[PDB]
């Protein structure tokens, strides 16, 4: 009946933000039509699907998220059927210029463009830069929910507070959910789990697994962890 | 004067911080060196965090962001982390810098370094993988740029995009190139053949398991194994070219 738009965000890189975006989107696509938007200048998601993009002959140096934001192409012509029930808007390195571009109403470009999107998805999942920048603002201003992958490091609580402060400044009342990634059984992960596990939007934990880098998934032990996380998330919204 | 080197790249995970640490450490053998951690990831800061904690530094008040906000003086943020090596630490509040509205925002680090009493032979600045106002602050007071590159797709295009960004700054900074995480395969040969002809190419760093382990979490001292020799060759070629 309406698209549910989930931003995956984290101010620290290497916390499984992009990995969680791919796997949650893929799990959702089992019974839903899902759109991935790769708004990360690293373009991790895009290059995970690059072999598929190549076999289809997509010209993503012309049709990508940055050119949507610059209003040079329409969003309809950028969408790539990369997997079962899964579409992608690819990222491209020119996106690096977005932060310095001078544009009117720059914060609302993604929201405006999504208002001109003919195709209809059950879920839209947005990967973001590990930064509190105008790109994150574009994702947040059209989102319904946020999922933040966290690791049990020093400044983990402080980093979550800084993100909360950034969303407040946007005058937004977004449910913000928490995942603990790279989970190991030791004191450092117990302290963060003990803090996080009390919060109503804590979804669960992902264990550090070597087997989980552009190969298909086989529903192993780490996929089950994401499956439990997704089930809890769906019960809370 | 101090010679001021920015380490930059627009792809993350290319050994940017690792190269900043190891080059600053090598230089510190015969020089007084200042490391400035201007990366919101704070990789350099948390590589030295055990030393910082033993000294009891309150770097949530004295850090690179509070310098840029003109809330603390640069002299009081400096931490002696190793032999002949000083550090200005990064702290997570630096994330707000990109959204702060400030006059002459591009020149805050340059102005700040003009008020620095201490005198260094070399200053080495670690940066975010981003074409943002933070990167501009580093470039506008640097003498040289070192870019670590990997054999990824679009690496040439990414270098062309970086050079265009430096050019728009009305800057004529010598830009040097390192190929990092080098493995023996076709993809790395293609980039090597492209880069090795360029005039400020410095050489290559091989991907090594023991170098991952020493900085990954062990926060370990270096032992001058084969990858340290690779960095030593890169530094010597660099020093002969400036
Ligand atoms: N639970 C995990 N188990 C094993 N490896 C992991 C796990 N989470 C992340 N990684 C690895 O961590 C690295 C970083 O990927 P990832 O963290 O997903 O990027 P990111 O944090 O989202 N930053 P970005 O790529 O800009 O979106 C990759 O090598 C992943 O394979
Ligand atoms: N040559 C190498 N051999 C082995 N591991 C490496 C090598 N270069 C980098 N790494 C590892 O790659 C990871 C990230 O390296 P890093 O120096 O942070 O790149 P960077 O992302 O460009 N700099 P930064 O963003 O500030 O952390 C670390 O775990 C390093 O140990
Ligand atoms: Li398909
Ligand atoms: Li489809």
UniProtKB/TrEMBL annotation, chain B:
Gene3D superfamilies: P-loop containing nucleotide triphosphate hydrolases
One Pfam assignment: AAA_31
Keywords: Plasmid
Domain AAA: residue ranges: 3-168
SUPFAM superfamilies assigned: P-loop containing nucleoside triphosphate hydrolases
Top-level taxon in the UniProt lineage: Bacteria
PANTHER family: P-LOOP CONTAINING NUCLEOSIDE TRIPHOSPHATE HYDROLASE (PTHR13696), PARA FAMILY PROTEIN CT_582 (PTHR13696:SF52)
Protein name according to UniProt: PF-32 protein
């Amino acid at each position: 009946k309406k698209p549910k738009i989930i931003t995956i965000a984290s101010i620290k890189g290497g916390v499984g933000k992009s990995t969680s975006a791919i796997i949650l989107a893929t799990l959702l696509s089992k019974n839903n039509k899902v759109l991935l938007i790769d708004m990360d200048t690293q373009a991790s998601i895009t290059s995970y699907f690059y072999e598929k993009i190549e076999k289809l002959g997509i010209n993503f140096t012309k049709f990508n998220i940055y050119e949507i934001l610059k209003e040079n192409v329409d969003i309809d012509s950028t969408i790539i059927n990369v997997d079962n029930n899964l579409d992608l808007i690819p990222s491209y390195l020119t996106l690096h210029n977005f932060s310095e571009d001078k544009i009117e109403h720059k914060d609302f470009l993604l929201k405006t463009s999504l208002g001109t999107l003919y195709y209809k998805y059950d879920y839209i999942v947005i990967d973001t830069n590990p930064s509190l920048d105008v790109t994150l603002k574009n994702a947040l201003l059209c989102s319904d929910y946020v999922i933040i992958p966290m690791t049990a490091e020093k400044w983990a609580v402080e980093s979550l507070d800084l993100f909360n402060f950034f969303v407040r400044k946007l005058n937004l009342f977004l449910p913000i959910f928490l995942i603990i990634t790279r989970f190991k059984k030791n004191r450092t992960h117990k302290t963060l789990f003990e803090i996080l596990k009390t919060k109503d939007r804590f979804l669960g934990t992902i264990s550090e697994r070597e087997d989980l880098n552009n190969n298909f998934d086989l529903n192993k032990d780490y996929i089950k962890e994401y499956e439990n996380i997704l089930e809890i998330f769906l019960k809370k919204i």
